[PDB]
UniProtKB/Swiss-Prot annotation, chain A:
Official protein name in the record: Capsid protein VP1
Functional note: Forms an icosahedral capsid of pseudo T=3 symmetry with capsid proteins VP2 and VP3. The capsid is 300 Angstroms in diameter, composed of 60 copies of each capsid protein and enclosing the viral positive strand RNA genome. Capsid protein VP1 mainly forms the vertices of the capsid. Capsid protein VP1 interacts with host ITGA2/ITGB1 to provide virion attachment to target host cells. This attachment induces virion internalization predominantly through caveolin-mediated endocytosis. Tyrosine kinases are probably involved in the entry process.
Residue ranges crossing the lipid bilayer per the database entry: none
Species the sequence originates in: Echovirus 1 (strain Human/Egypt/Farouk/1951) (E-1)
Taxonomic placement: Viruses, Riboviria, Orthornavirae, Pisuviricota, Pisoniviricetes
Subcellular location, record wording: Virion; Host cytoplasm
Curated annotation (Swiss-Prot), chains C, D:
Subcellular location: Virion; Host cytoplasm
Tree of life domain: Viruses
Name of the protein in its database record: Capsid protein VP3
Record organism: Echovirus 1 (strain Human/Egypt/Farouk/1951)
Subunit structure of this chain's protein: Interacts with capsid protein VP0 and capsid protein VP1 to form heterotrimeric protomers. Five protomers subsequently associate to form pentamers which serve as building blocks for the capsid. Interacts with capsid protein VP4 in the mature capsid. Interacts with protein 2C; this interaction may be important for virion morphogenesis.
Its biological purpose: Forms an icosahedral capsid of pseudo T=3 symmetry with capsid proteins VP2 and VP3. The capsid is 300 Angstroms in diameter, composed of 60 copies of each capsid protein and enclosing the viral positive strand RNA genome.
Residue range from the parent sequence: 333 to 567 of 2184
């Protein structure tokens, strides 16, 4: 080298795209069991991602969500249009393919057609708190008897997906895979790295593990 | 060569030099933000030492921990202000010190961990209030994994959080190593996402004391060394409760 | 000149452009100052951490014996106690420490590190140890005589309660060695168990650099 | 650098760009000044509105009994008349009022509000009431003695015909309480029905803030 | 189609389905047919200050390694 | 004036444009001076070389 480093900035230690989920849904009537599908935004799903966001106790960031979507027919039509709807937390949600929760005016939605560069949009920092909390040590209720940890803290919206075309002969099944990255990170208060494999996706519960590998003898 | 600090209505004698470790290099403050015209809040006579009950340290004892501010919930006037106010904030000054001869040995780690979140004894249960707190009485770690109906998964060497116990020196910390020290001081400021929150519902940080090199003694001598902790609030505030109106 | 040049349609991960915003109305929560802020990952690589030295088979399962090494009156002068390869990121004695764990997120790093010894015995115990360092590309000393002729610091316990060696020229076998040796046997006051201990701590020193991010090897996949 | 970066083809609702115009000829009708103009929704949140206090089961179907609370000579001192949770947007006593209805279009809001009491009895009636306020996270007073030791304003009817309490620190159970208590029984001139009434009005006070739009819960779908 | 670059010393997949396609530290390009072909540049990567087109040593610290292009 | 003029979609070998970067973080190894540098191919065309004159069959 010849100057101060800049590959170990907080902004470059984070802010890398990663797969976080994928899901399926297929053309069909509202009767059909799977014909819309949803994913709740959380960063605790993927172990690798989770590790690097438990380096810090508090974070605030905007995030970008890009969905890349493919489709294939199955054994024996016009180009399909897909709708991706973001529901901010505390909004209405659909329970079926046809509802007035897809017609609601306060839920952002992206209409996108195949053969175009994949849809994306950013979601700005949302929370009444001044940072997301990656550790919490309280209860939901005002007397201790609530739910321990991750209560109303770390609550973000959720996506929904459906086809926008009418059903037509021959089912089409789509697979949409979600990529996620934060941007404009700021971190406050560091933590020691996690040492034990994750168990639950909502608790810090762990099974005891050895600190380190054995050696053949301490002397050289 | 000693001096005795006094905060009025209480006094404690301390060694002259022992250093203070200011956690993150910032002292307790009163907030100075405006837009408190619609939520004015008054500042106070709680700023005095409170001495918690001493605990034995004996050879093969595994550690202890307490959780603030819910370890001072029965103490004096400060316990009344968790009950007549819906929101509060407050920094702390903590002196941990102990006796000892020159024939004793061993060293302990003192650390304050903001937002320490405990595990659960079984890996699908959920810990309840009575097993994660014990009031002003010390809770304790245990060596050797054992189940409990709720319980914290204490183990010492995971620290109840599934992290290396050797890496807890990232948080504000002091070593008390017999043959030099016998005291430590940590001044811990208010650290939370929101500026004020309910005292009962939340815990801010967990004091912990973990022996590494265990107590031992030369020929004769006492078989235990007592430890004592003393905690004094600094620069506390609580929400208002006065009308802004008139007739 | 055109805007449809090769590679203008594609989604390339780790490529930065602007993006439209879902809500261009709400976005407003004022930031407040919060004590302690991290803006670089070398601000947590220069923090001390207790490294485990003692590794047996159950002195590291229950790991409060992992961080401390026995000493005794029984042992004779000129026998070594511990020693290690000195190569963080591949030697399990300091690669699961706070400092060492940061260097498993990068490939190729350099700088210097500094180790610290702390004697935690009684206040009437006095001995002398000969600490030693071997340059990279030379084997560990085989005798206290050999060690002495190398680089060595005679550390008197009974004056100093700690010593700091700052070892330059680490980067990634060949690599140095650190070894501790009795020079004298410990002198007990009257203690009937001659157990005295010492710990060791490690941290990165001053300038340090890393390049080229990669994923850590210590967590394996999802499971839920 | 290119114009075909990921997310450049897509229609994202709530994203603003220019658009061509159907008629780029006609577009012309000159604006005129019109009395009264609203440019912010806190200009109609600071307007008083009569809140319904009395809720029975048909004193709010026919709702001209909904806005007023009986008083009588029969009642003895130290018995409360009305009281409420004090939490607009979730307590039906002030969440269907003009002010309260604006806060169902947002999630998370803060500021202060001010309530107003107006005695509407006869001009020869005189009594004294003890108004009271309990801080959030403390239950309602259970006695007039309890209420008195809290924050209280003794409001003499027979001097003042109204009182304004400005209550700070509302935001969204835990939340304060407002309670009114007899201090004395009302003194009638000679009226043979001792019915006297008081109303209550509410409005947001000074600074107020809302963030993050969402749809109201009080209308359900189309039906035509 | 997905094209994934793996920087040297990363994890690699051994089958169609692995967590090595879900890894967050390997750049990847999703691309659909009927678009201008995908490309991206890779910046100079090596701990050395130049690539070597001739080498005259052994892999091991004693000569007994692999000769050239180690 | 438009950006979709004929020949704006195509990949033409030996045509130079910018391109996104796979890693826009890592890229850092400082250059050092190295003795001898070639910047033109007439710097090795003006160097003497022994030419073979005698050609038989072996």
């Amino acid at each position: 080298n010849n100057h101060v480093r800049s590959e170990s900035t907080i902004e470059n230690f984070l802010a890398r795209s990663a797969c976080v989920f994928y899901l399926e849904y297929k053309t069909g009537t509202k009767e059909d069991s799977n014909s819309f599908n949803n994913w709740v935004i959380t960063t605790r799903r993927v172990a690798q991602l989770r590790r690097k966001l438990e380096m810090f106790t508090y974070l605030r960031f905007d995030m970008e969500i890009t969905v890349v979507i493919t489709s294939s027919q199955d054994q024996s039509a016009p180009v399909l249009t897909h709708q991706i709807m973001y529901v901010p937390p505390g909004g209405p949600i659909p329970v079926s393919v046809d509802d007035y929760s897809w017609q609601t005016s306060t839920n952002p939605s992206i209409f996108w057609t195949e053969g175009n560069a994949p849809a994306r949009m950013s979601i700005p920092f949302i929370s009444i708190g001044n940072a997301y909390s990656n550790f919490y040590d309280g209860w939901s209720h005002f007397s201790q008897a609530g739910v321990y940890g991750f209560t109303t803290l770390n609550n973000m919206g959720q996506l929904f997906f459906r086809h926008v075309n009418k059903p037509n002969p021959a089912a089409i099944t789509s697979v949409a895979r979600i990529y996620f990255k934060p941007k404009h990170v700021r971190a406050w208060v560091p933590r020691p790295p996690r040492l034990c494999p994750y168990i639950n996706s909502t608790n810090v519960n762990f099974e005891p593990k050895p600190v380190t590998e054995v050696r053949t003898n301490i002397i050289t | 060569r000693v001096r005795s600090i006094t905060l009025g209505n209480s006094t404690i004698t301390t060694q002259e030099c022992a250093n203070v470790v200011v956690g993150y290099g910032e002292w307790p403050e009163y907030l100075s933000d405006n837009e408190a015209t619609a939520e004015d809040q008054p500042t106070v006579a709680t700023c005095r030492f409170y001495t918690l009950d001493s605990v034995q340290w004996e050879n093969g004892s595994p550690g202890w921990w307490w959780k603030f501010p819910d370890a001072l919930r029965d103490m004096g006037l400060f316990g009344q202000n968790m009950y007549y106010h819906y929101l509060g904030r407050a920094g702390y000054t903590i002196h941990v010190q102990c006796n000892a001869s020159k024939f004793h040995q061993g060293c302990i780690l003192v650390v304050c961990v903001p937002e320490a979140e405990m595990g659960s004894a079984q890996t699908s249960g959920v810990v309840n209030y009575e097993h994660i707190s014990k009031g002003e009485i010390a809770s304790r770690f245990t060596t050797t994994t054992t189940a409990e109906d709720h319980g914290v998964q204490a183990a010492v060497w995971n620290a109840g959080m599934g992290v290396g116990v050797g890496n807890l020196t990232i948080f504000p910390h002091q070593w008390i190593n017999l043959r030099t020290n016998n005291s430590a001081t940590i001044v811990m400021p208010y650290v939370n996402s929101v500026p004020m929150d309910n005292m009962y519902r939340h815990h801010n940080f967990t004091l912990m004391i973990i022996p590494f090199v265990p107590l031992d003694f030369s020929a004769g001598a006492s078989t235990y060394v007592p430890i004592t902790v003393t905690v004094a609030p600094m620069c506390a505030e609580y929400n208002g409760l006065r009308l802004a109106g008139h007739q | 000149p055109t805007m449809n040049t090769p590679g203008s349609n594609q989604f390339l991960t780790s490529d930065d452009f602007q993006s439209p915003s879902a809500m261009p109305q709400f976005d407003v929560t004022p930031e407040m100052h919060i004590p302690g802020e991290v803006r670089n990952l070398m601000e947590i690589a220069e923090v001390d951490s207790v490294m485990p030295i003692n590794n047996d088979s159950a002195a590291k399962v229950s790991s409060m014996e992992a961080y401390r090494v026995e000493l005794s009156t029984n042992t004779n002068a000129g026998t070594q106690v511990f020693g290690f390869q000195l190569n963080p990121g591949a030697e399990s004695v300091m690669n699961r420490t706070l400092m060492g764990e940061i260097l498993n997120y990068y490939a190729h790093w350099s700088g210097s590190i500094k180790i610290t010894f702390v004697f935690c015995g009684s206040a009437m115990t006095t001995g002398k140890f000969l600490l030693s360092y071997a340059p990279p590309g030379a084997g560990a000393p085989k005798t206290r005589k050999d060690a002495m002729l190398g680089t060595h610091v005679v550390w008197d316990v009974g004056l100093q309660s700690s010593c700091v060696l700052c070892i330059p020229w680490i980067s990634q076998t060949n690599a140095g060695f650190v070894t501790c040796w009795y020079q004298t046997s410990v002198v007990s006051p009257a203690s009937n168990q001659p157990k005295c201990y010492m710990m060791c701590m490690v941290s990165a020193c001053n300038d340090f650099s890393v390049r080229m991010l990669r994923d850590t090897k210590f967590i394996e996949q999802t499971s839920f």
